[PDB]
Amino acid sequence: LSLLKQDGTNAGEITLNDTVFGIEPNEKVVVDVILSQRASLRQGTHKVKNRSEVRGGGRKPWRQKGTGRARQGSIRSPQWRGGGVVFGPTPRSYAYKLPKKVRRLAIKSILSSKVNEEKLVVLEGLTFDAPKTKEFAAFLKNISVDTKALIVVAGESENVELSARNLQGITVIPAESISVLEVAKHDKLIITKAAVEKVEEVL
Amino acid sequence: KECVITGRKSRSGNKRSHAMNSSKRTWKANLQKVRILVNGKPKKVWVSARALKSGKVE
């Protein structure tokens, strides 16, 4: 596929490795991995007090027989107004990983999908002399994005992260850090040639 | 109520029936009241028979 410069002009064409960008996408696998990655983000910090954890409630409120009232054991029994909760949330992890081979297939398949959808723009360079959001915004018009976009860069270029930090739909990531959920969260995938090399080197 | 030389004193454990019912009991040290001088001056102190065995003041 084609290989354009920051300015937006064509710079020949690059050849993506068909074992990473060519494979027939496995949608079912990508859905499993997306669900696992969403589940793994959960903090799970939710708790209630059961009848043991609620303040007080030690004594029998009134004698078992003779008063004409329903028998009761504690004022914190769960049918009482301020009483314990019967089950309800307990702090727990929601994280789980599919096997490594399934996780690699998922990233290969989501990346192949982007090529099929013509949502992957390969850039020769991408660099900025100084952190300037105005320049990064102009760049996105030249490349013709006008959507959410994941920008993948290798050649350190610290000025790219700063320049794109204040744009709302734009995420800049290393290349080592490319993940199924980050590619799925974003419409267009813009990647530098140097970054493509680093992604293929891993997959 | 403790050996001044060693520190022997009461310690708890079990009494056991045949049938192996257990109940708490103690083992007291064989403490004897004797005059010795740990500090220069003599004094009547608890000392275990075991501590007296061999070389003590009296």
């Binding site: 949608e27 079912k28 859905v31 499993d32 997306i34 669900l35 799925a184 969260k185 | -």
Partner: protein, 144 residues
């Protein structure tokens, strides 16, 4: 991300009891009526037979465990065909290739299958049949 479809049949809605009679699991919630099995925490321990002496106590204990029990990693001939002809098959070569991962007490070669190639196999033990078969092909067994 707005059109996620998990694989058909991979996920099923959990059954919730005690949520009305329409569901078929309302009220008694699948437990039927009364007795020990209807109660919270109810039910007898696993092999319990309501006081009839359980099976395991009707029958005797048998045998002992040997402190010095040797268990060998088993290699049937068939997998030795993997190797190239006139090759010297060691334990180290049998773990590198990935044929036996943990070499419990040693490597024993068993006959099961038939060998084609002419090898030189060294293992801790051979079955009489295995030895004959390795040799019948045109190889030498050594017992390291």
């Amino acid at each position: 991300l707005h059109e996620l479809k998990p694989s058909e049949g991979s996920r099923k809605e959990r059954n919730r009891v005690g949520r009305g009679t329409g569901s078929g699991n309302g009220k008694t919630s699948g437990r039927g009526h009364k007795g020990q099995k209807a109660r919270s925490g109810g039910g007898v321990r696993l092999g319990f037979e309501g006081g009839q002496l359980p099976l395991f106590r009707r029958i005797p204990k048998r045998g002992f465990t040997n402190i010095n029990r040797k268990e060998f990693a088993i290699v049937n001939l068939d997998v030795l065909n993997r190797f190239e002809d006139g090759t010297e098959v060691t334990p180290e070569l049998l773990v590198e290739t990935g044929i036996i991962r943990n070499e419990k007490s040693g490597i024993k070669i068993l006959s099961n299958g038939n060998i084609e190639k002419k090898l030189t196999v060294k293992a801790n033990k051979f079955s009489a049949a295995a030895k004959e078969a390795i040799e019948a092909a045109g190889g030498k067994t050594e017992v390291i």
